[PDB]
Coordinates of C-alpha atoms in Angstrom, one line a residue:
X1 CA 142.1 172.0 126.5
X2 CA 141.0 175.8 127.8
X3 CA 140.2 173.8 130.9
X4 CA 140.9 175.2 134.4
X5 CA 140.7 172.3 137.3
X6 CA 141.5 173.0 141.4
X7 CA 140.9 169.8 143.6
X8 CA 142.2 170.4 146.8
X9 CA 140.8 169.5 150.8
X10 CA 139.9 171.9 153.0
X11 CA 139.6 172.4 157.1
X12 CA 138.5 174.6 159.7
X13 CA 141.3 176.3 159.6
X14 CA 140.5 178.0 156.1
X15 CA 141.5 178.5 152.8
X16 CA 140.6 179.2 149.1
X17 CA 140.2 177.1 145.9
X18 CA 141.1 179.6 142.5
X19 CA 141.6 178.5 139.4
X20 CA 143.8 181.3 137.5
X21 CA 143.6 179.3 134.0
X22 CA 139.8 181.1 134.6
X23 CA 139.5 182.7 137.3
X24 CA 136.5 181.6 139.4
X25 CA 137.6 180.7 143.1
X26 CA 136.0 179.6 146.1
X27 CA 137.0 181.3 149.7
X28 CA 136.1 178.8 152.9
X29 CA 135.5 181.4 155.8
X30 CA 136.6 179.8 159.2
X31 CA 133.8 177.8 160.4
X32 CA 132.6 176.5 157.1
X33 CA 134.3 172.6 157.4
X34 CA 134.5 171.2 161.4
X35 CA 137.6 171.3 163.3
X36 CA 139.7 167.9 163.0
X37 CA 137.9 167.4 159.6
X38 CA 139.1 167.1 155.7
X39 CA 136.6 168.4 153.7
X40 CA 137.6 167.5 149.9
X41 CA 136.2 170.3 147.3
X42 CA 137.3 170.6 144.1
X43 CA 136.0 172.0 140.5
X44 CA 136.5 172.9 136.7
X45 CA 135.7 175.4 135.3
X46 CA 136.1 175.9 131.3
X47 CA 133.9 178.0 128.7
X48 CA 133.1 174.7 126.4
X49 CA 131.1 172.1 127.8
X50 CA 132.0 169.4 125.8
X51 CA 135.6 170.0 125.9
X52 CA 135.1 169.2 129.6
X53 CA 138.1 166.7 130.8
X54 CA 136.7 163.7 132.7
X55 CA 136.8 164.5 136.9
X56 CA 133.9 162.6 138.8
X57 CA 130.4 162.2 137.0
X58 CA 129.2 159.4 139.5
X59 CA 130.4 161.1 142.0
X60 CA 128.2 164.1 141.9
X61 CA 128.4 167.1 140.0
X62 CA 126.9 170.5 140.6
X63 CA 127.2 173.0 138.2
X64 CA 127.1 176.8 139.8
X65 CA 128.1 179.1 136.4
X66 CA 127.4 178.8 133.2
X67 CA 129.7 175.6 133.5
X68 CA 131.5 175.1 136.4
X69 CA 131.3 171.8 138.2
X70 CA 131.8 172.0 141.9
X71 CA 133.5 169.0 143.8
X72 CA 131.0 166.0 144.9
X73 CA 127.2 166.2 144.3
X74 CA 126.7 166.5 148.1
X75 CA 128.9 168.7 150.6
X76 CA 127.1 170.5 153.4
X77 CA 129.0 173.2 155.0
X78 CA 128.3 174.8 158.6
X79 CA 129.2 178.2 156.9
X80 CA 128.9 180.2 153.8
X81 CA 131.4 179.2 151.4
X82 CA 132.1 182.1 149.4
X83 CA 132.1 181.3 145.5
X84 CA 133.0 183.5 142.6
X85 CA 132.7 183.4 139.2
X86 CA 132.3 185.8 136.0
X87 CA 129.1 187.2 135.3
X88 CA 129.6 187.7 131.9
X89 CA 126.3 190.4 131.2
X90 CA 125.7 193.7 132.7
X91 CA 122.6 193.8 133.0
X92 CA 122.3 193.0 136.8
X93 CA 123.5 196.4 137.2
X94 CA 121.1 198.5 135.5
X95 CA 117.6 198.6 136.6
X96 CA 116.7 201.2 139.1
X97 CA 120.1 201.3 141.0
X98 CA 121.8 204.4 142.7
X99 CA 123.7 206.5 140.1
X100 CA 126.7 207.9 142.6
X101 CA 126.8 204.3 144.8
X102 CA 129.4 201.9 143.7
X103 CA 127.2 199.2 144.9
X104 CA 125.0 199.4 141.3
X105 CA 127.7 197.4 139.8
X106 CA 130.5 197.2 142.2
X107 CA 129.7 193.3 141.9
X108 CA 129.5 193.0 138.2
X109 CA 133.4 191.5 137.5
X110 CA 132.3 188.5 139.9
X111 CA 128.9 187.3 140.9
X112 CA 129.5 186.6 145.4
X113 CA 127.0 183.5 145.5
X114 CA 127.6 181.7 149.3
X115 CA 127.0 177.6 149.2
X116 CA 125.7 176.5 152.4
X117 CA 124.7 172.9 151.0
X118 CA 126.4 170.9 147.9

């Protein structure tokens, strides 16, 4: 339960993989999968780690946040996938940063972490 699972393929074309049960989501920017190509990405993400519901072990996974388990152990991509997921501590924010400039914690909500190789 308290589980939040997106499988879904992807193209050229372009797309996005969310999971509103948690939240994280995963953009594909044009150019990220081949044309004439299926690229089939999919995740869970969930705050219990035992409570995880059985996807694809032998098949590969690669976790990303503090549990999240991408699609198949083993996805190259010929563009920067963009992946976001919560954060979850503010302390990425505070350390030297510019006190009128969004940017010091404009990007605390969601961490923007590109995957160029699963």
């Amino acid at each position: 339960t308290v589980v939040a699972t997106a499988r879904g393929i992807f193209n050229s074309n372009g797309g996005v993989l969310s999971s509103i049960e948690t939240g994280v989501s995963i953009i594909i920017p044009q150019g990220a999968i081949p044309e004439g190509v299926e690229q089939e990405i999919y995740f869970k993400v969930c705050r219990d780690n035992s409570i995880l519901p059985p996807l694809d072990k032998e098949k590969g996974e690669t976790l990303l946040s503090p549990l999240v388990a991408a699609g198949p152990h083993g996805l190259k991509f010929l563009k920067p996938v963009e992946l976001r997921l919560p954060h979850c501590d503010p302390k990425t924010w505070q350390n030297k940063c510019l006190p009128g400039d969004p940017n010091y914690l404009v990007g605390a909500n969601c961490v923007s972490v590109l995957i160029d190789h699963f």
